[PDB]
Design a protein around this ligand. Structure first.
Ligand SMILES: *[C@@H]1O[C@H](CO)[C@@H](O[C@@H]2O[C@H](CO)[C@@H](O)[C@H](O)[C@H]2NC(C)=O)[C@H](O)[C@H]1NC(C)=O
Ligand SMILES: *[C@@H]1O[C@H](CO)[C@@H](O[C@@H]2O[C@H](CO)[C@@H](O)[C@H](O)[C@H]2NC(C)=O)[C@H](O)[C@H]1NC(C)=O
Ligand SMILES: *[C@@H]1O[C@H](CO)[C@@H](O)[C@H](O)[C@H]1NC(C)=O
Ligand SMILES: *[C@@H]1O[C@H](CO)[C@@H](O)[C@H](O)[C@H]1NC(C)=O
Ligand SMILES: *[C@@H]1O[C@H](CO)[C@@H](O)[C@H](O)[C@H]1NC(C)=O
Ligand SMILES: *[C@@H]1O[C@H](CO)[C@@H](O)[C@H](O)[C@H]1NC(C)=O
Ligand SMILES: *[C@@H]1O[C@H](CO)[C@@H](O)[C@H](O)[C@H]1NC(C)=O
Ligand SMILES: *[C@@H]1O[C@H](CO)[C@@H](O)[C@H](O)[C@H]1NC(C)=O
Ligand SMILES: *[C@@H]1O[C@H](CO)[C@@H](O)[C@H](O)[C@H]1NC(C)=O
Ligand SMILES: *[C@@H]1O[C@H](CO)[C@@H](O)[C@H](O)[C@H]1NC(C)=O
Lengths: 211, 114, 320
């Protein structure tokens, strides 16, 4: 709310479209002032001065120039229209993938991990407000690919093995939340001979103290 | 010798000072003088400091108003060494919810010329 | 437009004024294209907030990136592959045709590319979404295996095999580019099309268009102003038509290039700054990761994929 209220250039992308179209029309109208080799740019001046044979020569010059001017305008509008259509197709895609769903595509729905988006309408355009999750306040930990226990190699089911310097834990990857390493949050594959960088630590079994 | 003349300016809302680029020529043939790949730049102070690009000149050279107009090689961003090792991992302990805007054109004015 | 059509003749220049703003329009159109070209480059390569560097010691668990990383012994600081790519791809000025230099130099583009590689190698996909978070490369690869539905122990148990297949595959890229003349056809075609259009435009100055001569100086040295104006008008008409044809074709070609640049920017975000689930978007097979390499007026992506092999038949059931 505050940024838009204090930034004159915020909607430059939409203003540029307005400006380009205005410029093209102003140019087209201004071409009516050109003589194109005729005695006058004004058709009424020609008709009030000359009889039909001599007049047809002067008029033909204006027709040639004015037709060329109009063709130039239309060609430019067709090219510009294609560019706008591509933008509209992208906007429609974002509406579907950012607003009507949560997107995994990187940088498609804003910077960071996409949570959700909200559309706002604008003059000849659309504004998307993208809500993202951005990780913060990272800290360094020691890590290992696997834990060796009872002669078996254990891997995290969902998270990553970390150490605070003295104790080993398993945590979810995008948010530090250390938990005791157990048979509930790890899985076993083979022995401890294969994995490079495997470390020795206890793996806890919750039924142990019960049975 | 021939070529384009371009005028480098901060907005007239900010200043009336300008610098002039004489495209594709040596500064010797022109009549704060700095030769660039884009041509001869006159009226801008060339510095060895590097900044984000403000007004692009070409071939890495940009100009800005800092008072006088200065010319410099643009920076691509701050240098950052990631503390990589074979047993070190960095994990976020917090997060921030971010909201950003994206603006797209959808339609034009529907003109019609008879 | 004025110099192309009239040279430095004031007689022609004064006649050209009768046609209004056509030349201002043409100059504006070409300027718009030129500006776009720098925008295209920026949107592809300037996707990194910081200039990341790799560690002094390249210990990545057996993985070898020397062919894609900058070679410090070469003055351009390009990688071995980038150097190969760059090796594989006056009179115009005299007629009012010039070339403006890119805003970003090739050295600068290479710097962006190496920053992207350093980010990917040392922090995986984290530097794309926020602050770069370091992780051991083998662990990063294990995460990417999970991303394709393969358990992480498969990566670790076969680490040396995987690193060897990877290193070999990269080596083949080096060898293929060094022995295939047509490898960079897509980029060469752009160069050829633009050269052809300019050569055609210049050659049109040799046309008479119904005038006594294609040379404006011949007309002016032979005829007085009334008769001369007739001959000059013929040349103006033809030369203006030739220039309009050129500009229209450049605008259409520019749009095509912009679409390609938009796609390249999307691939940079989705293949390089992350792992993509989109089928065939980041190479054939299951996407693991990608590495950018800069090229003349373009970008080359090296896509690393997991391709299943040595299948065998089993009996199956939906339930037990
Ligand atoms: C990374 O791979 C490169 C090859 O792509 C190795 O560089 C070669 O090393 C051998 C010696 O073992 C030399 O005889 C070759 O001339 C080198 N080739 C090139 C192009 O430099 C490099 O040693 C590998 N790095 C590591 C740590 O293994
Ligand atoms: C899986 O495929 C790989 C090939 O990529 C086989 O590894 C090769 O095995 C041969 C012997 O059969 C060795 O001579 C090669 O040097 C090995 N290549 C590499 C890169 O190490 C591997 O044995 C296959 N695994 C299984 C279970 O069949
Ligand atoms: C991680 O350790 C490195 C030293 O290897 C240090 O420079 C860096 O600031 C530390 N980062 C954090 C978030 O603690
Ligand atoms: C690591 O965590 C354990 C359990 O919370 C704690 O007792 C220990 O003091 C911590 N070590 C360090 C160096 O903080
Ligand atoms: C990590 O590197 C150190 C040397 O810097 C080495 O002693 C250690 O064994 C390495 N760990 C792994 C898993 O390679
Ligand atoms: C882990 O423990 C086993 C014995 O159970 C031992 O042989 C191995 O060397 C230990 N690993 C390390 C790094 O101490
Ligand atoms: C022009 O300068 C005035 C201050 O003198 C400032 O308030 C205004 O926003 C500026 N306009 C623009 C477009 O920057
Ligand atoms: C003109 O500039 C070039 C560098 O762009 C330089 O090599 C050359 O010597 C200059 N010519 C003169 C007469 O200074
Ligand atoms: C910039 O550095 C060069 C040496 O590389 C020096 O000759 C020149 O005077 C310096 N200019 C300024 C403004 O510091
Ligand atoms: C699977 O069985 C079919 C026969 O039904 C045979 O033709 C095919 O080669 C076998 N494929 C493999 C990988 O064993």
């Amino acid at each position: 709310q505050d940024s838009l209220s204090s930034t004159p250039s915020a909607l430059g992308k939409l203003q540029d479209v307005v400006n380009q179209n205005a410029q093209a029309l102003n140019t087209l109208v201004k071409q009516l002032s050109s003589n194109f080799g005729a005695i006058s740019s004004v058709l009424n001046d020609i008709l009030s001065r000359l009889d039909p044979p001599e007049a047809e020569v002067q008029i033909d010059r204006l027709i040639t120039g004015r037709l060329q001017s109009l063709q130039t305008y239309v060609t430019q509008q067709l090219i510009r229209a294609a560019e706008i259509r591509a933008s509209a197709n992208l906007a429609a895609t974002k509406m579907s993938e950012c607003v009507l769903g949560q997107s995994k595509r990187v940088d498609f729905c804003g910077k960071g991990y996409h949570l959700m988006s909200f559309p706002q309408s604008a003059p000849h355009g659309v504004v998307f407000l993208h809500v993202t999750y951005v990780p913060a306040q990272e800290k360094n930990f020691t890590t290992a690919p696997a834990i060796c226990h009872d002669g078996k190699a254990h891997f995290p089911r969902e998270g990553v093995f970390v150490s605070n310097g003295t104790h080993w834990f398993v945590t979810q990857r995008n948010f530090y939340e250390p938990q005791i390493i157990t048979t509930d949050n790890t899985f076993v594959s083979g022995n401890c001979d294969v994995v490079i960088g495997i470390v020795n630590n206890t793996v806890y079994d919750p039924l142990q103290p019960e049975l | 010798s021939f070529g384009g003349v371009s005028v480098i300016t901060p907005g007239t809302n900010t200043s009336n000072q300008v610098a002039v680029l004489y495209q594709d020529v040596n500064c010797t043939e022109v009549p704060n003088v700095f030769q660039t790949r884009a041509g001869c730049l006159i009226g801008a102070e060339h510095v060895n400091n590097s900044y984000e690009c403000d007004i692009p000149i070409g071939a890495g050279i940009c100009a800005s108003y800092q008072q006088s107009i200065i010319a410099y090689t643009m920076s691509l961003g701050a240098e950052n060494s990631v503390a990589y090792s074979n047993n070190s991992i960095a994990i976020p302990t917090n997060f921030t919810i971010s909201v950003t805007t994206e603006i797209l054109p959808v339609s034009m004015t529907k003109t019609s010329v008879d | 437009c004025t110099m192309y059509i009239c040279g430095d003749s004031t007689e022609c220049s004064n006649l050209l004024l009768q046609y209004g703003s056509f030349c201002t329009q043409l100059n504006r159109a070409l300027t718009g294209i030129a500006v776009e070209q720098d925008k295209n480059t920026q949107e592809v390569f300037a996707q990194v907030k910081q200039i990341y560097k790799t560690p002094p010691i390249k210990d990545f668990g057996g993985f070898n990136f020397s062919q894609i990383l900058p070679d410090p012994s070469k003055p351009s600081k390009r990688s071995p592959i980038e150097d190969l790519l760059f090796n594989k791809v006056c009179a115009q000025k005299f007629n009012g045709l010039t070339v403006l230099p890119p805003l970003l130099t090739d050295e600068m583009i290479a710097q962006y590319t190496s920053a992207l590689l350093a980010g990917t190698i040392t922090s995986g996909w984290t530097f794309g979404a926020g602050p770069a978070l370091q992780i051991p490369f083998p662990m990063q690869m294990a995460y990417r295996f999970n991303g394709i539905g393969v358990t992480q122990n498969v990566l670790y148990e076969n680490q040396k095999l995987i690193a060897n297949q990877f290193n070999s595959a990269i080596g083949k890229i080096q060898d293929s580019l060094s022995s295939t003349p047509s490898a960079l056809g897509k980029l060469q075609d752009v160069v050829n099309q633009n050269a052809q259009a300019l050569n055609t435009l210049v050659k049109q100055l040799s046309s008479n268009f119904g005038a006594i001569s294609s040379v404006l100086n011949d007309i002016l040295s032979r005829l007085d102003p009334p008769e001369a104006e007739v001959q000059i008008d013929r040349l103006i008409t033809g030369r203006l038509q030739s220039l309009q044809t050129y500009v229209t074709q450049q605008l259409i070609r520019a749009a095509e290039i912009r679409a390609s640049a938009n796609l390249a920017a999307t691939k940079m975000s989705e293949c390089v700054l992350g792992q993509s689930k989109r089928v065939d978007f980041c190479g054939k097979g299951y996407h693991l990761m990608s590495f950018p390499q800069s090229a003349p007026h373009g970008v080359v992506f090296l896509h690393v994929t997991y391709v299943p092999a040595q299948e065998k038949n089993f009996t199956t059931a939906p339930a037990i």
